[model samples]
Target: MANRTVKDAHSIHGTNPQYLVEKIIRTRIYESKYWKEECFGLTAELVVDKAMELRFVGGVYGGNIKPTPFLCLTLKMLQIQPEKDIIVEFIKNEDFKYVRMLGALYMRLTGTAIDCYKYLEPLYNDYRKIKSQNRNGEFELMHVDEFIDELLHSERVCDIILPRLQKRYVLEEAEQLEP
Candidate 1:
């Protein structure tokens, strides 16, 4: 599985998908030049510090978005694999929007089904402003849920597709072998 890629038929969102997801994101971190040459050696605490000072989020919705470097950095944070308790702290904090978004993004990337339902579901209750430029080129507000829902449903958010949990791939393999 050295040069592995997560197929459209599979994912890394299972009870034990951490191993593969960890592998995938690690490869991503290694291949990123900005992640290496510029801000390469960021520790988890230091990364979170930078995320807190973030002024605007960049994505399809984040207005003239150039998200790769920022996305990789957060995924770098995700790759570090912080504890659930600590992540819960970020989720609970309202002061840091991008850090919270980073936590939310990590949860979508790695969380179990119930984790998404419980933690992410509550975020829809948040009424904070996420500014973005719509197609007409007007500034608009995106609710926190606007972004979270996209992650919850889309195969790739910010152009990253997390591998599915271990279940589907193994089952499909077993079934393919029979008869």
Candidate 2:
């Protein structure tokens, strides 16, 4: 695991693995100072918009583009960890679900421009609370145990938001695939 500075946190350049590129971008976008502004509310539409923006600019397409001089310099300060299926599964299964929940809440809190941190801070605190609650003298055990406990308590919030995002953004069955 590599520690990256906030300035170089989401660099999508260099020989970083495609998956790391995606994670770094997603993580930085979620934790962005811009999103912490009081004008941005936590909403499904905003979340979907942000997700698409990041994925398009820095997720898939970013991996294929050659690095410019500035990009290369930025990439050097960013850390790209080796890809591991288990780690991927852990992030998508546990962490992404929370992301989806934030999206759902954002939609629900329409008209109120709550700062992103206001929403996420409580969520993170709740996760830590549960993690501490579930610790049973097993210091060496992976954090997955706590994640699993939290996942069970949350009742899988992704299903609520994903269908809505797909309905809005995903291609309809009637849409032609070929021109």
Candidate 3:
């Protein structure tokens, strides 16, 4: 149970769902205190409580590259492979901005091109600022929409390599997503 994905979970992007997070960071998360204490036995529903407790968004930091609580939860999500509807609610929940960002990150990792655009593009209107921890263990202010834009266009975020998203124009041309 230390590192197992849920028994019925399907592969995302043709690999183990948890494999979406790189090995180094995943290993760090496994060793992290939060992952050991707070993340153990966290179900989809239980994760909401932890997400509510999140104070900032970040990846690994410090000389040892410790994983942030935010990143640990992201890995927990990948490990559990929560249901699509649950993840959607995580995205749709306006009361908790970090929860929304957590879901958005998971969506960017596992969702198809159309679903990614469909779910995440709407958050562009959210202008609330968020705390982000940089690689040097420093916190910076960022807006919700800025993070969403990065998820849409950036190759990497929070030190994780994002899957290649097909261009929105390409999706439109294929009739898979409306322009």
Candidate 4:
């Protein structure tokens, strides 16, 4: 037969729920202001190409179910930072944004909104500081402590925010769909 049980389950629940979830998470991460910063040194085409690679890796590994190649590379890149002048400059320019975007993505994947918010709040503050300084025409790179702090906090924030927002909107949509 044609795997009737699987067909029946899908018929009742719709298809590719995991895929839909991945799409939503990806959209939120890519659309975030932080992600914009991560694209700073790269051309639009290059950024899109990198994003495609990340998505392909994520999807093949079940969308955050395991440590992705991008994530592993990012971790290693972070570790060797002081030795790589170009990477140091790049991260100084974009680390805050990318870390926050990753945190938001993690929250979406893990369904933990409150915890994610807690984690992300500090990074938001750091970003505010950087933005304020820039606005005042001051240019100074963030310290390593500040960058690492934001990265850690942002991951927690992602773990907390994703599910809460999903629940909130799904409820809102359900009400809208009702007569």
Worst 10 residues of 4 by lDDT: 3-12
Better of 1 and 2 by TM-score: 1
Task: List TM-score per model, in order.
Answer: 0.62, 0.17, 0.97, 0.25
Query: Once model 2 is optimally superposed onto the true structure by TM-score, how far is the C-alpha of residue 75 displaced, in angstroms?
Result: 24
- Residue range 108-144, candidate 1, lDDT tens digits: 6776655655577678877787754443444567777
Identify the leading candidate in terms of TM-score: 3
Q: What Cα-based lDDT does every candidate model obtain?
A: 0.57, 0.27, 0.93, 0.33
Candidate 3 similarity to native, TM-score = 0.97
lDDT tens readout by residue for model 3, 1-179:
45989889998998998888888888889988999999999998899999999999998999999999999999999988888988899999979999999999999999999999999999999999999999999999999999999999999999888998999999999989878
List, residue by residue over 1-179, the lDDT tens digit for candidate 4: 11012222221123322332344444444444434445334432243234333421121123333333344323222222212223323333343444334333433333233433343334444433321122223334553335435434333321222122332344446563222
Please give the ranking of all candidate structures by TM-score, highest first, separated by commas. 3, 1, 4, 2
Which stretches of candidate 1 lie above 4 Å from their native place? 1-34, 59-69, 132-141, 162-179
Best by lDDT: 3
Spell out the clash pairs found in candidate 3: none
What digit string (tens of lDDT, one per residue) describes model 2 on residues 114-157? 22222222334333221111112222222332433333234322
Model 3 lDDT-worst window of ten: 1-10
**In candidate 4, residue 75 scores what lDDT?**
25
Error of 1 at 129 (Å): 1.8
In candidate 3, how many Å is residue 179 off? 1.1
Ranking of all candidate structures by their lDDT, best first: 3, 1, 4, 2
